[PDB]
Amino acid sequence: RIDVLKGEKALKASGLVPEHADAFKKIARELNTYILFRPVNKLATNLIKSGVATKGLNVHGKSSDWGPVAGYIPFDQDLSKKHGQQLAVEKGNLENKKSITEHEGEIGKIPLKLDHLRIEELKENGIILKGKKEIDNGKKYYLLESNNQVYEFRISDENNEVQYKTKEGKITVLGEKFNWRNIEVMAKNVEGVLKPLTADYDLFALAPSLTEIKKQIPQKEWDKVVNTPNSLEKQKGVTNLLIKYGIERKPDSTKGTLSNWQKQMLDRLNEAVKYTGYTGGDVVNHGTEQDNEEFPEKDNEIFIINPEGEFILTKNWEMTGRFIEKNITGKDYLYYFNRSYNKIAPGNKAYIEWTDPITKAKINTIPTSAEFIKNLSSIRRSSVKKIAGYLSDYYNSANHIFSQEKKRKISIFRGIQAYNEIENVLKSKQIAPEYKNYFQYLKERITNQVQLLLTHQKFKLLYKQLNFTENETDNFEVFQKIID
Amino acid sequence: RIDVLKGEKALKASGLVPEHADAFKKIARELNTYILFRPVNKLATNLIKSGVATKGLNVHGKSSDWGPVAGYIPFDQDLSKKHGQQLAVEKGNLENKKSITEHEGEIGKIPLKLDHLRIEELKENGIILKGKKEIDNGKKYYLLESNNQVYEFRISDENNEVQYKTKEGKITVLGEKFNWRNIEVMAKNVEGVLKPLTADYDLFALAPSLTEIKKQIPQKEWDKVVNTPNSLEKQKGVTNLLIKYGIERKPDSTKGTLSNWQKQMLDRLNEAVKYTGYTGGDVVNHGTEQDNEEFPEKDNEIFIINPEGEFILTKNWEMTGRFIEKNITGKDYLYYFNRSYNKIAPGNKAYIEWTDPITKAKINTIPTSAEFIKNLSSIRRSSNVGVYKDSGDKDEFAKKESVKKIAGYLSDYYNSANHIFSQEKKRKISIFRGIQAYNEIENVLKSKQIAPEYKNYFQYLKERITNQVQLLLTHQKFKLLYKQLNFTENETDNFEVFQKIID
Amino acid sequence: DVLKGEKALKASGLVPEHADAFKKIARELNTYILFRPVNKLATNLIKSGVATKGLNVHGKSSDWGPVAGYIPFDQDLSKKHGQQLAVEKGNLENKKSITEHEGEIGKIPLKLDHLRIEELKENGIILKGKKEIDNGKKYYLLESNNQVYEFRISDENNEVQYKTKEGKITVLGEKFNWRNIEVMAKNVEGVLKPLTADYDLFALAPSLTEIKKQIPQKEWDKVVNTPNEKQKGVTNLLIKYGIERKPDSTKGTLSNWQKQMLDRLNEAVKYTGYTGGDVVNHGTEQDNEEFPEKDNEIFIINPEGEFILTKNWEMTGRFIEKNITGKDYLYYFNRSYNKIAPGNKAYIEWTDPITKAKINTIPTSAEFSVKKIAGYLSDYYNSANHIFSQEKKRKISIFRGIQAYNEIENVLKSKQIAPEYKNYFQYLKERITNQVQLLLTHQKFKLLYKQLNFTENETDNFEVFQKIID
Amino acid sequence: TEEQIAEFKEAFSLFDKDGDGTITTKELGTVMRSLGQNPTEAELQDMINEVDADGNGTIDFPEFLTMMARKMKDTDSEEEIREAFRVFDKDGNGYISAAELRHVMTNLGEKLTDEEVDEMIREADIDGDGQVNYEEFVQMMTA
Amino acid sequence: TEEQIAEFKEAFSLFDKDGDGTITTKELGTVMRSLGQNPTEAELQDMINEVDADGNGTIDFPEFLTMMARKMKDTDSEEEIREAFRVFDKDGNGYISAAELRHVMTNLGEKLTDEEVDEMIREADIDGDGQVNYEEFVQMMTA
Amino acid sequence: TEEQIAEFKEAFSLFDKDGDGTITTKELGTVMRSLGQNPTEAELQDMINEVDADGNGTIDFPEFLTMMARKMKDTDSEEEIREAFRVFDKDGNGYISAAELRHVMTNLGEKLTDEEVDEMIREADIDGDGQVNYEEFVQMMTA
Numbered sequence A: 001r002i003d004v005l006k007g008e009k010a011l012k013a014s015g016l017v018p019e020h021a022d023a024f025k026k027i028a029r030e031l032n033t034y035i036l037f038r039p040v041n042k043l044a045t046n047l048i049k050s051g052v053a054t055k056g057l058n059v060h061g062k063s064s065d066w067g068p069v070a071g072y073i074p075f076d077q078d079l080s081k082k083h084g085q086q087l088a089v090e091k092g093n094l095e096n097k098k099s100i101t102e103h104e105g106e107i108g109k110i111p112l113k114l115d116h117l118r119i120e121e122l123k124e125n126g127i128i129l130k131g132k133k134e135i136d137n138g139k140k141y142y143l144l145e146s147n148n149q150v151y152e153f154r155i156s157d158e159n160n161e162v163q164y165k166t167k168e169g170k171i172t173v174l175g176e177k178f179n180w181r182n183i184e185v186m187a188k189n190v191e192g193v194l195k196p197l198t199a200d201y202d203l204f205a206l207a208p209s210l211t212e213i214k215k216q217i218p219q220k221e222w223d224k225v226v227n228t229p230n231s232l233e234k235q236k237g238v239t240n241l242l243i244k245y246g247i248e249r250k251p252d253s254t255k256g257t258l259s260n261w262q263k264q265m266l267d268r269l270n271e272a273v274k275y276t277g278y279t280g281g282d283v284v285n286h287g288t289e290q291d292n293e294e295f296p297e298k299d300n301e302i303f304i305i306n307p308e309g310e311f312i313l314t315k316n317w318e319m320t321g322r323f324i325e326k327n328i329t330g331k332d333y334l335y336y337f338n339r340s341y342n343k344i345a346p347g348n349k350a351y352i353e354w355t356d357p358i359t360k361a362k363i364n365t366i367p368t369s370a371e372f373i374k375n376l377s378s379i380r381r382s383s384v385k386k387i388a389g390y391l392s393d394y395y396n397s398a399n400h401i402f403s404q405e406k407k408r409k410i411s412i413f414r415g416i417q418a419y420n421e422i423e424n425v426l427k428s429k430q431i432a433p434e435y436k437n438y439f440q441y442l443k444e445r446i447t448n449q450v451q452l453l454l455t456h457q458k459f460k461l462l463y464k465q466l467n468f469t470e471n472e473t474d475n476f477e478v479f480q481k482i483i484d
Numbered sequence B: 001r002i003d004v005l006k007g008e009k010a011l012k013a014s015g016l017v018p019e020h021a022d023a024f025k026k027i028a029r030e031l032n033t034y035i036l037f038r039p040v041n042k043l044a045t046n047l048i049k050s051g052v053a054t055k056g057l058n059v060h061g062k063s064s065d066w067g068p069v070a071g072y073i074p075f076d077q078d079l080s081k082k083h084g085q086q087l088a089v090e091k092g093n094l095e096n097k098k099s100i101t102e103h104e105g106e107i108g109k110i111p112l113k114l115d116h117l118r119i120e121e122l123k124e125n126g127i128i129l130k131g132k133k134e135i136d137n138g139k140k141y142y143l144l145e146s147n148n149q150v151y152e153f154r155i156s157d158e159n160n161e162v163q164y165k166t167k168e169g170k171i172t173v174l175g176e177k178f179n180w181r182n183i184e185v186m187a188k189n190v191e192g193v194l195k196p197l198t199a200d201y202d203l204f205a206l207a208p209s210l211t212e213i214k215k216q217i218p219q220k221e222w223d224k225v226v227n228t229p230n231s232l233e234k235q236k237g238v239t240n241l242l243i244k245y246g247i248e249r250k251p252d253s254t255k256g257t258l259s260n261w262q263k264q265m266l267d268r269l270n271e272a273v274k275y276t277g278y279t280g281g282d283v284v285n286h287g288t289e290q291d292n293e294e295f296p297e298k299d300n301e302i303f304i305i306n307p308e309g310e311f312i313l314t315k316n317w318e319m320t321g322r323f324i325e326k327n328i329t330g331k332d333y334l335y336y337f338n339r340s341y342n343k344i345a346p347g348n349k350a351y352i353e354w355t356d357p358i359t360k361a362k363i364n365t366i367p368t369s370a371e372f373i374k375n376l377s378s379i380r381r382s383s384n385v386g387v388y389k390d391s392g393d394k395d396e397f398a399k400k401e402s403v404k405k406i407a408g409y410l411s412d413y414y415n416s417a418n419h420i421f422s423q424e425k426k427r428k429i430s431i432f433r434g435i436q437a438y439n440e441i442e443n444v445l446k447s448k449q450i451a452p453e454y455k456n457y458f459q460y461l462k463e464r465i466t467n468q469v470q471l472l473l474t475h476q477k478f479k480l481l482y483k484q485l486n487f488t489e490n491e492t493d494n495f496e497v498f499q500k501i502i503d
Numbered sequence C: 001d002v003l004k005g006e007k008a009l010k011a012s013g014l015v016p017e018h019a020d021a022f023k024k025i026a027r028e029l030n031t032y033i034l035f036r037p038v039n040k041l042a043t044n045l046i047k048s049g050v051a052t053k054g055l056n057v058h059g060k061s062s063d064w065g066p067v068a069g070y071i072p073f074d075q076d077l078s079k080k081h082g083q084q085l086a087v088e089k090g091n092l093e094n095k096k097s098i099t100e101h102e103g104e105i106g107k108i109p110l111k112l113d114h115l116r117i118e119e120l121k122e123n124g125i126i127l128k129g130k131k132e133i134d135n136g137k138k139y140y141l142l143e144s145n146n147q148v149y150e151f152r153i154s155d156e157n158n159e160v161q162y163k164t165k166e167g168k169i170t171v172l173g174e175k176f177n178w179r180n181i182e183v184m185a186k187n188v189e190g191v192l193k194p195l196t197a198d199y200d201l202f203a204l205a206p207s208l209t210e211i212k213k214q215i216p217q218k219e220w221d222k223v224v225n226t227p228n229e230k231q232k233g234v235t236n237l238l239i240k241y242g243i244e245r246k247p248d249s250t251k252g253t254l255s256n257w258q259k260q261m262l263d264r265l266n267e268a269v270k271y272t273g274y275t276g277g278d279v280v281n282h283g284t285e286q287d288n289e290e291f292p293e294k295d296n297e298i299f300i301i302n303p304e305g306e307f308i309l310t311k312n313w314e315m316t317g318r319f320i321e322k323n324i325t326g327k328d329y330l331y332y333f334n335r336s337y338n339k340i341a342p343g344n345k346a347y348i349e350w351t352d353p354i355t356k357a358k359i360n361t362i363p364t365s366a367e368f369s370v371k372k373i374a375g376y377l378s379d380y381y382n383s384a385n386h387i388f389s390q391e392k393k394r395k396i397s398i399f400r401g402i403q404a405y406n407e408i409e410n411v412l413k414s415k416q417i418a419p420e421y422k423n424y425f426q427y428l429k430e431r432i433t434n435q436v437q438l439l440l441t442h443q444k445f446k447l448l449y450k451q452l453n454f455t456e457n458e459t460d461n462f463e464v465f466q467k468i469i470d
Numbered sequence D, E, F: 001t002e003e004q005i006a007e008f009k010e011a012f013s014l015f016d017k018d019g020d021g022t023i024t025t026k027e028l029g030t031v032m033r034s035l036g037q038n039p040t041e042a043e044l045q046d047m048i049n050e051v052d053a054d055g056n057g058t059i060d061f062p063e064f065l066t067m068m069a070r071k072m073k074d075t076d077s078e079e080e081i082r083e084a085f086r087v088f089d090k091d092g093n094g095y096i097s098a099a100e101l102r103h104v105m106t107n108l109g110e111k112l113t114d115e116e117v118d119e120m121i122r123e124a125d126i127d128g129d130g131q132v133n134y135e136e137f138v139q140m141m142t143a
């Protein structure tokens, strides 16, 4: 039992527009595939529902969750959710400036106008309050308050444009100060007219049923594998067929990096919400998060819609991990996790951890020469050949003509072989402090692996009785008998 | 009508030393040229007047506007105006460290000494207050206060050196904490002696009279161009002199990037203030801000001195724009605005907007074959590079309909050959050429959705081509006359019907 | 104006026993030992045998809250608390330690042992407060005068957890509920053990005798037994075995003798009962050229065995000057001093006698048919000069200087000379002036320049000047 | 710059029924013309002969990229011109009018007649709109 | 990437009794094999002949660095595979079992018999542990 | 190393009545000497003959920049020396005195006489000031 919210309560925290979510159950079910969304700016929801357009990959400015511009994409990113975070604000603005220039006529900015109804919406949510009136150059304004301490906001009675200025003696994060001026918001060009943008639905991950993936594979391209006398070169093409149509992903022009089935699924989603009335366009604009390798966001609450059509909301990252494990990656569903996890994401240096079974095993599994070499590469950030060779001997596909009983033997030996060509390197010179550890490590691994193969059938115990001294098909003779 | 301050009140906000400003009226007038200054550290003014030297391009540390070191250039940039801004402080210091090392013996730092009179000046301005006395190692000190909460300052009675330390439990922006220690200030080497520096007069922009620029042109060279037949090459001749002598600029060694007339004007300015007594040296050390393309500063208040000799102080950027528009760039005066405006300044990523007519009209203007082929490049940043030919998945198709014609047809629109025809003719041949391109384009979109953004580029061209044509037409008589025209068979025939259609 | 004994040791941060133990080595090896400050809240942990951080861990320790004394993974819980850039730079460092050194370094939940809480209560760092129950689990709040975070400890396993206060925001602009406090740890025998501040050594100044002892009796002889180079044969046997330093990874850049001196220091501490291995993991700050730290208080233990604690950098400089670099002891100061350290752009100043008496002159351009460009004019220090007599030299010298006085120097009005060059030549001239009066006063520049007229090849005026020796 | 080379690359691959990337001098001109230039047949020879010693008449990018790397030297004044345009346009309407052309001229000494003026405008005018737009002002300054 | 070239550099200097840095084709294979590859003698010729026109049989880094700069193109799918491995391994034990191999298969249409299944495992299995570890899953998908 | 090359560049162009940038071996020495070096006529040949196979006797920068790129290897100890100087100078006056030279020596074993000492100072002394300044200490340590 995990502690996750369900239905109504969860949808509430998801941020998606109810109608849209309900509409999504349909696709989740029909296509038997889990749909997971990253949080959605709650103050964005209503805007979305009212048909406002959402931001695509050509807009990386962060939305706002406070003040009159709440729900929109303020040009001045210190008015966004990243308010007060110098680096984020700065990185945020550069992004907007880029959106404005590298995409002229595509994206632009426009003054924020708070419609009569929106002010109301905001009053309820307790975000801002229409206050006392003010007159400034023969012009009528009405102050708009917020518990914020740096800025002061007001709205024009005529055109309903909102303006803001820095408070007395107060200073912007970027160390600015200014008087009354319009609040610009990111907008996209729609039919020659510039229309404001708002948060979109960011997909955390799409987990389809293996079967659903099958439908992606062409009926005779699969048979040309299924129906193959051989077994090895089959299990390969069957896997490569999973990859190509199920796993592999590619950088689309504006949809970011996503796969092909994902592209479809994407369209179904946007379709679904348009049938409900969404006239803003797409609500989902790109690949998913597990492919967002440069700037991974680690959210606490994930909103999941299972192929049943139910609503679940993981409470915390650790939990989201469980859910995915118990109900997806462990239940015949296609799933791959962000390649940056367990590494330092290049873009924002994020370090999001995730459970990776392959690693778990590392401790009991001797390495391939490549890994062994590539471990000597990334160990050069600050020298002998029979080892990497032997490791290449351990993993030899030639073994596919021998018997398990044989295999273990030849392997058990090959391991002991390497454990030797290694033991003597350390018996040799200290070389580099960290290189010493690498071998004390290999040793243990090689040890465990061997010791493992042995308990499969019958380490150091049988290590005192073996040869080092004169090298061909002879030192291997004694061993044969030793294992029996 | 604009809300700008004038005279005395404006001068007050300008920061320039009164005498110096008055002295400037002279040059503004005499040379019939607008002079615009960026704000000047008000707490720097008096220091300047008292003959303190100003900082040149070899010193990028920011001045201070509070505390005892107000007006000077503190080595510890957290004592400057950028106080409390970690990144700015840090960037500020690196700059000082550089000034100190990459310019040894040229620039240096020295302890700040507050002269008996300066303390007084500071007391009036309400910056610091001489407080209680203190004795610390047999040495007499007098506390100096400030409404600041991080630092504490005191001054030596003997040599008048000011020291400062961080308050109890308080922490520096850079996360430091230390006890009493001298306040060092940037200084320059003058005759083997190190003298303190202060804010200089940064010129926002210099707008001279076209005529004044004429005096720059050698009367002979103006002749070898004003004396010739070719009516068209008549203008092009002056245009290039106007440039060569007033528009072009170059990177000087220490004066940054400025033009030649500007170099002169610069000297007149420094001359002028020396006539009044300024013994510090130059008060103006660099080209104007309009050439400061890497790190543009966007100030709110600009101080302008018109060729009349009056003082104006724009209240805000938007206003400064108007002023310049209504009284300079629209009144026969030479003016060019920072090339970084409307772009992302490379240095500080600033994005200062300015009104650029050329653009404000590129909506009713048809693109150049080049002002197109180049776009196709930029828009090629949202895809992978490979082969222009054969871009489809199918092997039966290898070409995006109207590949080059759209370009050529644009090169046809802008043909200098048209200089032998009549306007009436021109509009016609052009109006057509446009409709021609609007076709070779319309069919590209009619062909395949090629790239999402490439689609927009054409929906754009379309509109433009549209406006341009529709514009030429209302000059004399769009889609209305688009239904009745040929596509199907391509030489001097589809052009015949058109002829009559326009009448 | 420096603290001494007990009082100083108190401020040093070292574990008393360890310091006392150090007197022994300082004395025995006649060598000054200088330590940079040590996190006071780290002291006790060290003493209780906790392991210290080596160069593979650059996260900063903490000096407040339950995690005080350790290396929090979340660097906003460290001493750098509240310093966005430092926190961020700190974390990246931890992330790196965790990844680029897998299985070597790791992180683990912080557990506050029954005694530690007590220790913390005395130091007045945290207080065990009211109880709390959260999912059938028993917790006890731990307070701190901090305003951003809130801490609690589990009664079962004694794990400490923390969360951000209501409406409060992390420096990095975060907010989260209850979660474990992870701490940097190193792998020890397959088990992950927590780390703490080490004993970062400031400097080491051995009795000049000691570096001799370092030299092999042979290599020394082949130059001391009248092989007179000697004059330079010594300095080089002084360099290679006393000044020369080189990288090393586990330890950083340091010197052979230093390496040894390390070992003795470490061993020297085991004896007191220190379990967690080494406390001195790497070369001295004077070789930490990329990211120099400028501390206020330095802890010094003189070859006598006494304890001194400089109060401030300016003072630490004096101490070193009066009692070390001026008293026959080997010492070299961080090569980054007086320069902009590359790594952190630090600019720590130090007194360089060489720059002291910098009123002298040599290959400048350090400043960056018909013979006029050629000729021997920029070579004041003519090696071939030991042939002349001290008098000739001082006499000829002045001449060579003046030779440069009006060389190509009077070119003060070549086209448009920048105040930068003039300033130099000027200065240079200001040098040649003093770089003469001395040679004079030794045995008697603004003396007589009217008795000098250089309007011909230096050879012609050569005779002149020699006649001016009067 | 990146865009620079990027631009020369766009046109180059615009017309090239060669495939791999090698055009002829029979079209080299059209390229430089579509890319905003008006070279004379005399200049299209002394260059395609200095660097192109192949004697085959085949041209690719690396070669072309270098030719442009020379011409675009004392002509890259694109800026100065654009600024100058803005100088004439007093009313800031985005176009240069006769009245405007007058002032600039008269203020520079050359006093022109309402006739001569209107002559220059028409000459420079290419669309017949009765005014000079930047694009036109450009051609007129670099033909 | 840096590591990429860094990797090719590690092995290259691993075996080279030449010194300066020049090996032979008599060992070129061993190198590519120790670095995780199984090239055929037919491919080790048509390449060492295109770039190596020296006719000496001497090879260095800059040359080798380029060959790898081609092969590692439509094979760098290391990721996709590694991910696929994780897809089969339902129990997340780090190894692929027959039972597991079954599901993936049956769920993809191909219904296999407890015999055929155990055949595939045993074929792919290299150590005889009775299961497929990533390393093995890799070889089986590459070699 | 920017400054390094920058330094070798300063002197190189200091004397060169060639113009473009090509000097002779008749002056190559003067260059290396003005740049702080004392090479022997024997070393100024075996090098200007290995890299300079032109047989013309013409030298430029790229060539020179490489020669220096070799000599400045086991001599760049500028640091170590400078530090050593500071070690002798106990009084921190910036100069090395006989008294000082004594200690360092006696403390290193070699007990010298007030005579021998004063001999070394004078030998190392170049200006006759009766003391050794860093510059001098340097020359004395160069060879």
Ligand SMILES: Nc1ncnc2c1ncn2CCOCP(=O)(O)OP(=O)(O)OP(=O)(O)O
Pocket: A038, A041, A055, A057, A059, A060, A061, A062, A063, A198, A199, A200, A202, A255, A256, A257, A258, A286, A287, A288, A289, A291, A292
């Ligand atoms: N496949 C992908 N390709 C590129 N970027 C991606 C991909 N998937 C995710 N990202 C990164 C960011 O997705 C958009 P972004 O605007 O940053 O979302 P957000 O931060 O949730 O919006 P908000 O700020 O409007 O709340």
Ligand SMILES: Nc1ncnc2c1ncn2CCOCP(=O)(O)OP(=O)(O)OP(=O)(O)O
Pocket: B041, B055, B059, B060, B061, B062, B063, B198, B199, B200, B202, B255, B256, B257, B258, B286, B287, B288, B289, B290, B291, B292, B293
């Ligand atoms: N023409 C130019 N070329 C290059 N840089 C320029 C030009 N004009 C201005 N600059 C750049 C920096 O100007 C000086 P700076 O001293 O940094 O000004 P400031 O910030 O107003 O000084 P203050 O800090 O002394 O108040």
Ligand SMILES: Nc1ncnc2c1ncn2CCOCP(=O)(O)OP(=O)(O)OP(=O)(O)O
Pocket: C036, C039, C053, C054, C055, C057, C058, C059, C060, C061, C196, C197, C198, C200, C251, C252, C253, C254, C282, C283, C284, C285, C287, C288
């Ligand atoms: N010889 C050297 N080589 C390289 N780096 C060095 C050397 N000597 C010192 N350093 C740099 C930093 O020493 C370790 P560091 O962990 O940063 O100390 P600290 O700052 O005192 O730790 P603390 O944060 O735990 O109090």
Ligand SMILES: [Ca+2]
Pocket: D089, D090, D091, D092, D093, D094, D095, D096, D097, D100
């Ligand atoms: Ca106009």
Ligand SMILES: [Ca+2]
Pocket: D125, D126, D127, D128, D129, D130, D131, D132, D133, D136
């Ligand atoms: Ca026109």
Ligand SMILES: [Ca+2]
Pocket: E089, E090, E091, E092, E093, E094, E095, E096, E097, E100
């Ligand atoms: Ca498994």
Ligand SMILES: [Ca+2]
Pocket: E125, E126, E127, E128, E129, E130, E131, E132, E133, E136
């Ligand atoms: Ca196996």
Ligand SMILES: [Ca+2]
Pocket: F088, F089, F090, F091, F092, F093, F094, F095, F096, F097, F100
């Ligand atoms: Ca001395």
Ligand SMILES: [Ca+2]
Pocket: F125, F126, F127, F128, F129, F130, F131, F132, F133, F136
């Ligand atoms: Ca001397």
Ligand SMILES: [Yb+3]
Pocket: A055, A056, A200, A201, A202, A285
């Ligand atoms: Yb998104």
Ligand SMILES: [Yb+3]
Pocket: B055, B056, B057, B200, B201, B202, B285, B286
């Ligand atoms: Yb300035």
Ligand SMILES: [Yb+3]
Pocket: C053, C054, C055, C198, C199, C200, C281
């Ligand atoms: Yb350390």
